[PDB]
Design a protein around this ligand. Structure first.
Ligand SMILES: [Mn+2]
Ligand SMILES: [Mn+2]
Lengths: 271, 274
């Protein structure tokens, strides 16, 4: 039950120029995380430089995240997105990350029910091509359940349908995203347990399926029940990381410090 | 010469729910008295022949085709394929008799740092320098849109002007509401960018998308928020604007009701000016 910090949680301070990647790694080390989950949106940095940062701060990468359009209808774009996915897997090898998580589509690019219907077999086809490459390199490939309901990978049923058609594919469960999809987060974990190798933890306070809008909350101040998840995870001997995600407006370092105090308290009660 | 168009994006909620298809949006636009639709194109699955058939049935035209394309892609092969995709969108404009294309040239989730923003900008410009001559060769006006996610280097007046002045022939779709998000005065944006503006998106915001100036904003029915459309209309009429004014709505009210309610306000304000 080790914790990892998503670099994506610090995006506000990276966008403002207050933190660079090394600062995020250093901050994760100082806050006691065992790893970072690295969002990779370009290959501008050399692997050498990232490996150096990780050695300096005695940090590891639990998972590399990327947004890739595996729903692309246009053949040449679709093929280049598979190639990009392979390049991300290559980066996981270079950086000693055991896992990749793909968000396999973009919400602004699904503009109708017919688009959603067509996107699903396309995503599945892409993942059947990419997952064997990940396996050959010794990398565990996952998708994430998402929060924009026009993407055909949000509900328990949707993610299960993909997982059951892609040999070897695994799941990063975003516990809070299930709430947006109208699912019970704990039920999602129970139904998808055999595929869940990574988890994102984020909270919401009171657009959903159940028709009620949510705001990002500091962990423990919203509606998500983390202790119940941790209890089941310990019971089931989950061996992946618990990744800290925050998408709100509180200063990102403060959000991590405050939310981690709640999460560690809840885990310690279960242990 | 002030004409209204309906963004198909404004109807996306009912398209996603299966309540409306593209033809329904075209027919709705015709029934509500629009001069055109602005078509969001996210794939080429629709037959060009069938779109043209729909436009003829409903006596409608397409004023502009909108697309999201990642012209900031750092990996060369992806970058080149996104230039080719943009050229294929221009070809679709020819096939559909749309005079204009609007690209949103990057994706907010793919710019994760200030350095990423810095590196994206010359990349986007270089792509647009390749795409714009192709649009010109096909008689298509190419535009970008000023956006609302401030990590993208195309939101402020200064950012959009920097791109436009480096890409010969490039023009602008002014999203008047997005300028408010960027901390600009929407009317001053129009005045400073007037010679480039060939299309406009009209949307409104109410004070409850995070602004530069602090205020929290949510989509508003037009006329119920803070955007002054009459002042814009008065200036465009004064300058003999010949383009379209495109109706954009991003909120939660039923999309057909939002068009009916918002257009009543917009037409009233334009009428007070002419
Ligand atoms: Mn997540
Ligand atoms: Mn717009």
């Amino acid at each position: 039950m080790k914790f990892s910090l998503m670099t994506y949680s610090m995006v506000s301070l990276m966008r403002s120029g207050e933190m660079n990647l090394e600062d995020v790694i250093a901050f994760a080390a100082n806050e006691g995380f065992d790893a970072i989950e690295l969002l990779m949106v370009n290959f501008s940095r050399s692997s050498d430089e990232i490996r150096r940062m990780l050695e300096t701060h005695q940090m590891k990468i639990s998972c590399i995240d990327a947004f890739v359009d595996l729903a692309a209808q246009q053949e040449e774009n679709f093929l280049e997105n598979i190639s990009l996915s392979q390049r991300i897997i290559d980066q996981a090898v270079e950086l000693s990350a055991p896992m990749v998580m793909l968000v396999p589509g973009f919400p602004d690019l699904i503009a109708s029910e017919k688009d959603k219907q067509q996107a699903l077999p396309r995503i599945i086809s892409a993942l059947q091509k990419i997952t064997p490459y990940a396996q050959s390199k010794g990398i565990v490939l996952t998708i994430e359940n998402y929060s924009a309901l026009q993407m055909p990978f949000c509900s328990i049923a949707e993610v299960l349908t993909i997982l059951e058609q892609v040999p070897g594919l695994r799941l990063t469960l975003d516990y809070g995203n299930m709430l947006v999809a109208g699912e019970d987060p704990l039920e999602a974990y129970e139904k998808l347990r055999k595929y869940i190798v990574n988890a994102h933890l984020k909270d919401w306070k009171v657009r959903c399926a159940d028709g009620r809008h949510l705001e990002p909350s500091l962990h423990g101040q919203g509606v998500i029940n983390f202790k119940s998840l941790f209890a089941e995870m310990v019971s089931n001997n989950y061996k992946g990381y618990l990744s800290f995600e925050y998408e709100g407006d509180i200063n990102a370092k403060e959000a991590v410090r405050l939310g981690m105090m709640h999460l560690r308290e809840q885990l310690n009660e279960v242990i």
